[PDB]
């Protein structure tokens, strides 16, 4: 499955 | 130059940090505020709303020559089936555990034809994903639904400037930028003080 | 760190529709 | 300042004539060019495309306090039946006889809920009429019924170029693809204020 | 000298007009 | 029974 790590830019 | 449907690159400055370089795809130019663009940044799934030509954090904006990819939708009826539906969208965590997020599929994204706009009960901002892939992998459950719709009864809210009070009592503003075609009581707000797109339900209270 | 309001119920022109509220998608139900 | 769905009044200067006031209803703001508004002027049935904030002929634009009228559609199924159909639309002439114009009903108009977008084989610009009234009066015949508009990459938002016989290049924009008739498109030319209706035709 | 819309449109400024098609004004000879 | 006299503004 996908991960939430790619949901938003870090900043 | 119209930049909608183009790939762009620009610098960004977060706080007093270094200028960082970002690439993305311009999805939309908001009609009720044509300074406001909706952008998908490479590698990240959230939709950003930025006044690209006004925002003091944006520099060195250029249109890239590379074309946005266009792939044929694998199952067009499935795409149509999920639009407007509640879903359970499965993600996985660092220990491999499955983490289901409840949300709603809102629309096909503009420009990027295999992507879908989606938002979540526990993260009420606009995201986009290639959900037919999640669906075929078994990671998307489409829930069934349960003229008098609030969004059909009221005068149009789109282009209205919203006002709200912080806990400290000062006034802040934003704009109703969109009404969801498939779900007319669902609206997008862009707040003047933030670059996410927030999703609201118009609810009858009396 | 910006916090979106749970409820929106005002427009600057005073025209927010009587009998309704905009609820953030995270609003309690 | 969102003026879509508002009644407006402004001055207009035609050539070197007097400034004249006109009243109308703002129907739409074109997504591919948000400077371009579609307007129905009171008394007239043609849809006008004007860049109301940029056009040097427009002055003293004001939003009127009056709300646009709404009526409930008299026959909702009939409204849905007409969309995308060829029609024969009867108009009367000065000797009282009726002249049938061949055309096509394109869509429900935005903002003005009982009005319909229609164009004509012999006058290929965008008009709007309360066609349920024409139909009940006996003045509208509804004709019975891989698509180019499904095959091609989206044309909407593209800038068109053409040259007249005298060879100068002129421009315009594909502003809309008809939902009910996907091979039918609306073009707004930079040198005129009507909305023109085009068929996308396969030639090879 | 009233504006006259072109009977056919077959060019985009970016050169991308689709091969094998033409836009014909709804009044085009049929 | 509409007429073309209301089709377009006079100018
Ligand atoms: Cl939508
Ligand atoms: Cl109040
Ligand atoms: Cl349409």
Author numbering:
A (entry chain F), F (entry chain C): 1 to 11
B (entry chain D): 51 to 196, 203 to 262
C (entry chain E): 255 to 283
D (entry chain A): 51 to 195, 204 to 262
E (entry chain B): 254 to 283
Sentences from the paper on this structure:
This unique bivalent histone recognition results in dissociation of HP1 from condensed rDNA chromatin to relax the chromatin structure and facilitate the recruitment of RNA Polymerase I, leading to productive transcription of rRNA.
The electron density map of C11orf84 amino-acid sequence T255-Q283 is clearly defined and adopts a unique stem–loop conformation. This segment inserts into the cleft between the strand β1 and β4 of Spindlin1 Tudor 3 to form a closed β barrel-like structure. The H3K4me3K9me3 peptide fits snugly on the surface of Tudor 1 and 2 of Spindlin1. Simultaneous recognition of K4me3 and K9me3 appears to be facilitated by the distance adjustment through the short α-helix formation of the H3 fragments consisting of residues 4–7. This is distinct from the extended conformation of H3 peptide observed in Spindlin1/H3K4me3 and Spindlin1/H3K4me3R8me2a structures. In addition to cation-π and methyl-π interactions induced by dual methylated lysine recognition, the N-terminal amino group of H3A1 forms a hydrogen bond with the side-chain carboxylate group of D189, while the guanidino moiety of H3R2 is ion-paired with the side-chain carboxylate group of D184.
